[PDB]
Design a binder for this molecule. Structure first.
Ligand SMILES: *[C@@H]1O[C@H](CO)[C@@H](O[C@@H]2O[C@H](CO)[C@@H](O[C@@H]3O[C@H](CO[C@H]4O[C@H](CO[C@H]5O[C@H](CO)[C@@H](O)[C@H](O)[C@@H]5O)[C@@H](O)[C@H](O[C@H]5O[C@H](CO)[C@@H](O)[C@H](O)[C@@H]5O)[C@@H]4O)[C@@H](O)[C@H](O[C@H]4O[C@H](CO)[C@@H](O)[C@H](O)[C@@H]4O)[C@@H]3O)[C@H](O)[C@H]2NC(C)=O)[C@H](O)[C@H]1NC(C)=O
Ligand SMILES: *[C@@H]1O[C@H](CO)[C@@H](O[C@@H]2O[C@H](CO)[C@@H](O[C@@H]3O[C@H](CO[C@H]4O[C@H](CO)[C@@H](O)[C@H](O[C@H]5O[C@H](CO)[C@@H](O)[C@H](O)[C@@H]5O)[C@@H]4O)[C@@H](O)[C@H](O[C@H]4O[C@H](CO)[C@@H](O)[C@H](O)[C@@H]4O)[C@@H]3O)[C@H](O)[C@H]2NC(C)=O)[C@H](O)[C@H]1NC(C)=O
Lengths: 293, 301
């Protein structure tokens, strides 16, 4: 057993059919010692007595809020969370894994340090999330995450849909030109009723880069059918643009798209264009399209 | 009065004609209390007695090394330095100021944190220097300076020459990309015989930048008299070169000397000279800091 927060405890449990439950002692935080009574928010009536209650916790009915009582007045109360372990494996039932069997998908528009992570949920009901820096050493990269939000978009995998969640985070210390020598190691804590699970990931910001679409994609004709198309870097992108250079791909929407490093080209013809980091093969941006007219 | 180092004290003195000198008590660092006598390395014979010597210090003869004695044997000794103050202003007589009336001139070849400061001296005799971080707060910029060295070069100002000194320094904490939020505050301690003075300066490394000359300035002709000249960034310059960009100036030889040079951001150009020298200097693309020394080659093919 281990403490998640004040008077909230997590109990690791083996979920095999004939598993021996964990015996856990829960003492009351009070000076009195007589007439002490215990109750549960799952079971009806008195389920124990004495300042310290000793119980065998295997099923979820053994979880919930345990309250002390003496002489009709309430005292302290402790909460028990369950962490399932089946076949030696920690349960992964709150989250729905992506096609690649991973759970967390993060993406960043620039090297500033800001990024967002998102996840899927199997059933959006009675959920509680909490994200933080896994490693807490001095030579670790400190991260300050925001609050998790339910997304309007519903992902469709197999032939089934799933609600998506998302959270924004910012990296504490940065020196933009420098190379990242160790990754950002994250850990997601998930609660659902009295079930506890947690998911971890490590990554470098460079691998999660996804620029924003190019702005002001304008047109100007020249001669019969030939036309020059121009645009400009997005406002979100890192500066200076001489350092965070970009390579753009140009396709024609009625793969086979051709790369152009300048911010304009002439071609005969929808005209769609996406962006990518010039020097690193990171994720490309969303397409910015305009009619070939 | 205040202690500079073990048994070396500094005495601030008002140098007006009729100023009352500061009376300072000097006790001996010894357990004995009898038969105690004092001497000076300036005055002849015994100049005092008693465990504690009380004197009025106004002129420089009142300075120097004061030694204790008992029965012909030497005891401890303390050294006194004077800081002159005239019309409320602290004296600046050991160093010779540059044309711009400043005393310290520093220059750095890159944003690494390394840089050097130099000064002139009025009389190169019996000198002792020491440079350090003036502010000693947590949010100050810590700097580790070296030892002052006599330079071979002798500057000539007006119609008179002066010996030059220089010292190299490195900033404790650095992050090439980092923004400068507070300046480097330095302080030079200068000693000359029994005279004490000190000079202070504040600056951002960006303002003292002076790049090294561009390397490998090659030529290759093309057409009549026309020829393309190419080069590359100096090895000393900060990396990556994509971030620490430069602006180059190109002149034709028959801080920044900006009279008939034309700017070129690329590392090569084509130009007509048909003989002579082609000189080129460098500068930071984004900041108007000091330019580098010229790199010249003959316009020959
Ligand atoms: C560049 O050059 C300038 C010019 O030389 C130089 O400037 C000076 O810097 C030095 C060192 O930083 C300063 O010296 C310090 O002065 C401190 C203050 O001293 C005064 O106040 C004392 C008050 O004592 C009373 O009040 C307290 C209240 O708390 C009480 O307890 C006491 O009992 C007492 O009642 C006073 O006593 C003292 O008097 C002495 O000095 C005067 C002359 O100033 C003299 O006339 C007296 O006879 C007597 O000798 C003075 O008036 C002082 O506290 C400090 O010393 C302590 O702290 C150090 C910390 O390291 C301890 O090691 C040490 O043991 C003491 O506890 C120190 O002496 C000096 O005042 C500056 N002068 C000026 C004009 O600014 C710069 O530093 C140079 N720059 C660089 C980078 O080198
Ligand atoms: C993701 O999910 C996993 C799975 O739940 C989390 O894993 C566990 O993390 C916790 C917290 O980091 C670990 O707990 C600690 O355990 C150590 C060591 O305890 C062991 O050795 C002791 C030797 O003296 C022994 O006494 C302990 O015995 C008790 O526990 C066992 C069960 O392990 C039980 O059977 C006994 O009856 C006892 O009750 C145990 O064998 C312990 O020293 C730690 O104590 C410190 O922290 C507590 C909490 O504040 C504090 O009160 C103490 O004073 C002390 O400062 C702490 O309890 C646990 O071991 C991990 N388990 C596994 C399998 O890895 C993981 O943390 C999650 N990740 C994230 C990022 O949250």
């Amino acid at each position: 057993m281990w403490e998640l927060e004040k008077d909230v405890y997590v109990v690791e449990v083996d979920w095999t059919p004939d598993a021996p439950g964990e015996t856990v002692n829960l003492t009351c935080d009070t000076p009195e010692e007589d007439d002490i009574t215990w109750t549960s928010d799952q079971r009806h009536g008195v389920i124990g007595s004495g300042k310290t209650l000793t119980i065998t916790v295997k099923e979820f009915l053994d979880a919930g809020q345990y309250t002390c009582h003496k002489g009709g007045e309430t005292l302290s109360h402790s909460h028990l969370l369950l962490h399932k372990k089946e076949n030696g494996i920690w349960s992964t039932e709150i989250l729905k894994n992506f096609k690649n069997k991973t759970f967390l998908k993060c993406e960043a528009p620039n090297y500033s340090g800001r990024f967002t992570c998102s996840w899927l949920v199997q059933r959006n009901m009675d959920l509680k999330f909490n994200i933080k820096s896994s490693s807490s050493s001095p030579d670790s990269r400190a991260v300050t995450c925001g609050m998790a939000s339910l997304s309007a978009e519903k992902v469709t995998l197999d032939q089934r849909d799933y609600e998506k969640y998302s959270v924004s985070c910012q990296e504490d210390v940065t020196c933009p030109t420098a190379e990242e020598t160790l990754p950002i190691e994250l850990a997601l804590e998930a609660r659902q009723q009295n079930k506890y699970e947690n998911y971890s990931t490590s990554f470098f910001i460079r691998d999660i880069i996804k620029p924003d679409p190019p702005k002001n994609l304008q047109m100007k004709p020249l001669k019969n059918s030939q036309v020059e198309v121009s645009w400009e870097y997005p406002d979100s992108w890192s500066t200076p643009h001489s350092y965070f250079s970009l390579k753009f791909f140009v396709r024609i929407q009625r793969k086979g798209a051709f790369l152009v490093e300048k911010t304009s080209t002439e071609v005969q013809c929808n005209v769609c264009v996406q962006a990518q980091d010039r020097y690193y093969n990171s994720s490309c941006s969303k397409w910015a399209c305009v009619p070939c007219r």
